[PDB]
A paper describes a structure:
PX domains have specialized protein structures involved in binding of phosphoinositides (PIs). Through binding to the various PIs PX domains provide site-specific membrane signals to modulate the intracellular localisation and biological activity of effector proteins. While all PI3Ks must interact with phosphoinositides as phosphorylation substrates within the catalytic domain active site, membrane-associated class II PI3Ks are unique in that they additionally contain PX and C2 domains appended to the C-terminus of the kinase domain. The PI3K-C2α PX domain folds into the canonical PX polypeptide chain topology comprising a three-stranded β-sheet meander that packs against a subdomain of 3 α-helices.
Numbering used by the authors: 1421 to 1536
The structure:
Amino acid sequence: DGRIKEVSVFTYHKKYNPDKHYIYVVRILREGQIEPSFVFRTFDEFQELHNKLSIIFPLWKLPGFPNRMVLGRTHIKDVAAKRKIELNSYLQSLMNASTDVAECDLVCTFFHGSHH
């Protein structure tokens, strides 16, 4: 797009600063820079990002977002490991979205500020 040239979920980990949950480490590569940046975002921030996109855009403009209640009974680390994938495909979908999605303020905010 503008600056952002590629994004990906690079890896994640199991934090305890309140109690849980996981953090997803997101690698971003901008046009104006040679080195990636990395930001850290939980499942619920990506959710909160989608929810705010829906306020201002029609859903058919946006990727679908990955949430299953519990598949059936599963499973701490296991869900983290399926989110690495699902969040990453969300991200690829969201940034090859129209320009007004890819480059809109709500999606640049999401991606500024390592922990914020």
